[PDB]
Amino acid sequence: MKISFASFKPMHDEIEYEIKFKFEEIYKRNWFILGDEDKKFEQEFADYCNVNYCIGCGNGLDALHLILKGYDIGFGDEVIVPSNTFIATALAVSYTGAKPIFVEPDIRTYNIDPSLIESAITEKTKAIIAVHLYGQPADMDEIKRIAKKYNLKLIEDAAQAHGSLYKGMKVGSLGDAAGFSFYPAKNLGSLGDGGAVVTNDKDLAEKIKALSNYGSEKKYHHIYKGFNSRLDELQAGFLRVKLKYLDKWNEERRKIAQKYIAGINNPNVIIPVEADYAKHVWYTFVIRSEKRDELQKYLNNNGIGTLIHYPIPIHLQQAYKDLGFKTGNFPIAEKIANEILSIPIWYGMKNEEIEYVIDKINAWK
Amino acid sequence: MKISFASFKPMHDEIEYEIKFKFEEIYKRNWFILGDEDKKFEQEFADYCNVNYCIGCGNGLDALHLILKGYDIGFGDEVIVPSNTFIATALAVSYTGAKPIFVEPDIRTYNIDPSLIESAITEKTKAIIAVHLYGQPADMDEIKRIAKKYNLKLIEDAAQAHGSLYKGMKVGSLGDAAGFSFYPAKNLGSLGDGGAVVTNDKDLAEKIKALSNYGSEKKYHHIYKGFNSRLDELQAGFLRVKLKYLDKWNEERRKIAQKYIAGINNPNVIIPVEADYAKHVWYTFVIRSEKRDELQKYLNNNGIGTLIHYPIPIHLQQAYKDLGFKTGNFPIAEKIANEILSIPIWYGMKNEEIEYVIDKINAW
Numbered sequence: 001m002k003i004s005f006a007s008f009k010p011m012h013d014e015i016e017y018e019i020k021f022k023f024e025e026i027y028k029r030n031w032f033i034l035g036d037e038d039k040k041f042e043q044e045f046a047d048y049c050n051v052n053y054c055i056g057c058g059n060g061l062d063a064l065h066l067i068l069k070g071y072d073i074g075f076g077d078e079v080i081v082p083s084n085t086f087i088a089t090a091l092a093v094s095y096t097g098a099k100p101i102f103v104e105p106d107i108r109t110y111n112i113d114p115s116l117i118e119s120a121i122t123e124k125t126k127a128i129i130a131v132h133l134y135g136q137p138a139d140m141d142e143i144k145r146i147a148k149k150y151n152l153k154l155i156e157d158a159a160q161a162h163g164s165l166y167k168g169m170k171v172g173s174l175g176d177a178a179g180f181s182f183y184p185a186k187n188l189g190s191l192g193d194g195g196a197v198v199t200n201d202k203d204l205a206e207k208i209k210a211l212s213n214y215g216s217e218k219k220y221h222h223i224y225k226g227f228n229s230r231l232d233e234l235q236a237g238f239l240r241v242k243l244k245y246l247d248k249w250n251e252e253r254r255k256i257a258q259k260y261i262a263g264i265n266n267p268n269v270i271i272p273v274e275a276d277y278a279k280h281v282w283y284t285f286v287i288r289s290e291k292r293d294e295l296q297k298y299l300n301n302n303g304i305g306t307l308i309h310y311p312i313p314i315h316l317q318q319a320y321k322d323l324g325f326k327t328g329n330f331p332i333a334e335k336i337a338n339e340i341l342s343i344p345i346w347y348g349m350k351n352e353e354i355e356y357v358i359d360k361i362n363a364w365k
Numbered sequence: 366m367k368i369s370f371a372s373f374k375p376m377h378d379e380i381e382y383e384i385k386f387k388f389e390e391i392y393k394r395n396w397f398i399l400g401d402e403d404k405k406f407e408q409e410f411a412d413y414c415n416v417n418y419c420i421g422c423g424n425g426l427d428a429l430h431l432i433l434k435g436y437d438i439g440f441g442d443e444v445i446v447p448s449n450t451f452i453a454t455a456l457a458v459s460y461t462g463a464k465p466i467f468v469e470p471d472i473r474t475y476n477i478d479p480s481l482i483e484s485a486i487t488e489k490t491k492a493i494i495a496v497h498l499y500g501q502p503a504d505m506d507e508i509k510r511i512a513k514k515y516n517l518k519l520i521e522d523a524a525q526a527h528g529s530l531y532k533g534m535k536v537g538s539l540g541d542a543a544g545f546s547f548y549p550a551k552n553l554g555s556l557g558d559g560g561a562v563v564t565n566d567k568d569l570a571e572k573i574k575a576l577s578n579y580g581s582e583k584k585y586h587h588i589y590k591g592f593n594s595r596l597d598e599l600q601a602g603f604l605r606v607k608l609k610y611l612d613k614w615n616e617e618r619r620k621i622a623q624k625y626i627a628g629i630n631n632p633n634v635i636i637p638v639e640a641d642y643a644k645h646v647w648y649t650f651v652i653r654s655e656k657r658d659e660l661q662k663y664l665n666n667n668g669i670g671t672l673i674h675y676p677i678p679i680h681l682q683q684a685y686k687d688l689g690f691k692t693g694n695f696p697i698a699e700k701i702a703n704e705i706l707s708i709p710i711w712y713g714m715k716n717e718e719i720e721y722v723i724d725k726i727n728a729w
C-alpha cells in the first residue's frame with residue numbers, strides 16, 4: 001500500500017467542473033486584478049469568520065506583516081510569538097524592523113503557553129501573535145487578558161486553522177486581527193499563493209487595503225509606501241467555490257483523526273490532543289516519539305508519506321543566528337522539533353488506507 | 366465609436382483554448398507552487414532575455430526589491446531612479462530601508478538622463494535603477510559607463526519593456542540584473558500578479574531564489590530572513606503560452622504606433638519618438654499637451670479611452686513627503702506629469718479604430 005502525506009485529488013476531482021467554470025468565467029471577463037471575486041470572497045470570508053472586514057493579499061506571511069504595518073509596528077518595537085511556530089510568523093515581524101520575541105508553547109497544545117507571556121513583555125512590546133497550530137486555537141481567553149492588561153494588539157496567526165472554533169467562535173474573530181494563508185495545502189487552499197486579513201477594525205482594514213495596493217486608496221494617488229500583495233481574481237474565485245465545502249471537508253478530516261485517535265496503540269508515540277475549548281480542524285495530525293527519524297524511515301519504507309513541522313526551530317535557523325540563541329534556550333520547542341511528526345490525513349483517505357497507517361504505526365518496534 | 370484604452374479580447378480570444386488546456390493540465394497535476402511550469406518558464410524567459418538565469422516572483426515591485434535585497438542594499442544606502450517612473454520603482458528601494466534618489470529623464474525619451482546621473486552619486490549610493498519606460502530602453506551605454514565608474518550595481522526596471530531591444534540587445538540583458546512585471550496589462554501579462562528577475566550573476570540568482578522562498582534553498586532550513594514572493598505554476602504556464610507570440614503581438618503593436626506617428630499632426634500634440642538605438646515595444650504610446658486635461662476629456666467624450674502615466678510625481682506623492690520636495694524641485698518630471706497622456710494601443714485595434722483615433726486627435 002502507498003499513502004501520500006497529502007493528496008488533493010479527491011477534493012479537486014470533487015469540484016473540478018465547478019473550478020473549470022469559475023476560471024472560464026473570469027477569463028472571459030478579462031479582469032484579473034482587484035475585481036468582483038475579490039469583493040465577494042472578502043465579504044463571504046469575513047462572513048465566515050464573523051468579523052466586519054476581510055482584505056485579501058498575496059500570502060499568509062504577507063497577511064501578518066501588513067497587519068503589523070497597518071498597526072505601524074516596525075523598528076524598536078517588539079512582538080511576541082511562539083517559540084515553536086513556522087518561521088513565517090517571524091519573518092513577518094522582522095520584515096517590519098520590529099523584534100520577534102519568543103514564548104514557549106504548552107506541549108499539550110503545541111500552542112503558546114499564556115502563563116509564559118507576561119514575562120516576555122517589555123517597554124518595547126507592541127503585540128502578541130497567537131498562532132493556531134495544526135488547526136486548533138491558542139487559549140485566547142487567557143491570551144486576551146494579558147494583552148489587555150498590557151494594552152498589546154493581539155493578532156491571530158490563523159494560517160493553519162480555517163474554520164476552527166475556540167469555545168464556539170471562529171478563529172479570525174478572536175483577537176484584534178487575524179492573518180490567513182490560502183497556500184495550496186491548507187484546509188482552505190488556493191490554487192496558488194494566497195492570503196487574507198480579517199478584522200472588525202475599519203481603519204486598520206482601510207490602511208491595510210491601500211498598503212497591499214502600492215499604498216494607494218484612489219487612482220494616481222499614493223498615500224503610503226505600500227507594496228503589492230493582492231489576491232488574484234482567479235484565486236479568490238477558486239476560494240469562493242472552496243469556501244462552500246470547508247466546513248464539509250473539515251468534518252471529514254475530523255472523522256479521520258478520531259479514527260487515528262482511537263486506533264493507535266503504541267507506547268512510544270504520543271498522539272495529538274484536541275484542546276477542550278477547541279474544535280480542531282486537523283490541518284496536520286502530529287505525533288511525537290523519541291526515535292522520530294527511525295519511526296519516520298520505517299513509515300516511509302512502508303509507503304507511508306510523512307513530513308515534519310518543523311524539525312528545525314526558528315532560533316536555530318541560520319537565518320536568525322544574530323539573536324545568538326543556541327540549543328537549550330527553548331528546549332521545549334527544541335524537544336518538539338526533535339520528536340515531532342506529521343502523518344497523512346487528507347480528505348478522501350479511505351479506511352483501508354487509514355487502518356493501514358494505524359496498523360504500521362502500532363507495529364513500529 | 367468606442368475605443369477602450371486597452372482590451373485583452375483579441376489576444377485572449379486568440380489563445381483562449383491553449384490557455385484553458387494549460388489550466389486544465391495543471392489542475393489535473395495538482396502541483397501548484399514551484400513546479401515544472403515555473404522551471405520551464407524560467408528557462409524559456411532567461412533565454413529570451415538571453416541571460417543565464419531567471420527567478421520567478423510575485424510582481425515587478427518584488428522583483429526590484431528582491432534584486433536589491435539580494436545585493437544587501439537597504440539601510441544607509443542610496444539607489445538612484447528616474448524622477449518620473451512608476452512609484453513602484455521607489456517603493457522597492459524603500460522596502461529595503463534604502464533611500465531613493467531621483468534623477469530627471471531626457472524629455473526626448475522620457476528616460477533617465479545619464480548626463481544627470483553623476484551629480485547624485487554620494488558615497489551611500491549603491492545602484493541606479495534605469496527604467497525602460499513605455500516600451501523602450503534608457504540609454505544604457507553611458508549608464509554602465511557611469512555605474513562602472515562608481516562600482517555601482519546597474520539594475521534595469523524592465524516591467525514596461527518586454528522584448529524591446531537596445532542597439533539590438535534585449536532588455537533585461539543590459540546591466541547587472543533586470544526586474545519584469547507580469548502585471549496583466551503588460552506586453553507580456555499573466556492572468557494575475559506576476560514578476561520575474563533575470564541575471565547572469567549566479568550568486569545573486571541563487572540568493573534571490575532562497576529569498577523569494579522564505580529565505581530557503583533547502584527544505585526545513587532557512588538561511589536568510591526572506592519572504593514569500595513566487596510565481597504561481599498557473600501564472601507561469603500562462604506566460605509560457607504567451608511568450609511564444611510575445612514577439613508577434615509586439616510587432617502589430619508597432620504598426621499601430623508607426624501608423625499614429627505618420628497620421629497624427631496637430632500643433633498642440635507632441636507625438637512620442639523612438640530613440641535611435643531602440644526597438645520600442647510601445648507598452649505605452651504617450652503624447653504631451655499644454656492642455657492635457659481638456660484634451661483627455663475631449664478624447665473621452667468621443668469614446669476614446671486613455672490613461673495617464675503618470676499624473677503625479679513620486680516626489681509629489683503623499684507617500685514621499687518625508688522627502689520634503691515641492692513643485693519646482695523636479696521640474697522636468699513636474700512638467701510631463703502635467704502634459705502627459707496615453708491613448709489606446711492594443712493588439713487587435715482595427716484600421717478604422719486607429720483611424721477614428723487619429724481622426725479626432727487631428728480634430729482637436
Ligand SMILES: Cc1ncc(COP(=O)(O)O)c(/C=N/[C@@H]2[C@@H](O)[C@@H](OP(=O)(O)OP(=O)(O)OC[C@H]3O[C@@H](n4cc(C)c(=O)[nH]c4=O)C[C@@H]3O)O[C@H](C)[C@H]2O)c1O
Binds near residue numbers: 426548558674
Ligand atoms: C516601471 C515599473 N516598475 C515597477 C512596476 C511594478 O510592477 P508590478 O508590481 O508587477 O505591478 C511597474 C508596474 N507598473 C504599472 C503602472 O504603470 C500602472 O499601469 P496602469 O495602466 O496604470 O494599470 P491599469 O490601470 O490597471 O490597467 C491598464 C489597463 O488594462 C485594463 N485591464 C487591467 C487589468 C489588471 C485587467 O485584469 N484587465 C484589464 O482589462 C484596464 C486598464 O485600463 O499601474 C499598474 C498597477 C502597474 O503595474 C512599473 O511600470
Ligand SMILES: Cc1ncc(COP(=O)(O)O)c(/C=N/[C@@H]2[C@@H](O)[C@@H](OP(=O)(O)OP(=O)(O)OC[C@H]3O[C@@H](n4cc(C)c(=O)[nH]c4=O)C[C@@H]3O)O[C@H](C)[C@H]2O)c1O
Binds near residue numbers: 005061
Ligand atoms: C503558522 C503559519 N504562518 C504563516 C504561514 C505563511 O503563509 P504563506 O506565506 O502563504 O506560506 C504559514 C505557512 N505554512 C506552510 C508551512 O507549514 C509548510 O507547509 P508544508 O506542509 O511543510 O509545505 P508543503 O511540503 O508544500 O506542504 C503540503 C503537501 O502538499 C503537497 N502539495 C503542495 C503544493 C503547494 C501543491 O501545489 N501540491 C501539492 O501536492 C506537497 C506536500 O506534501 O511550508 C509551507 C510552504 C507553508 O505554506 C504558517 O503555517
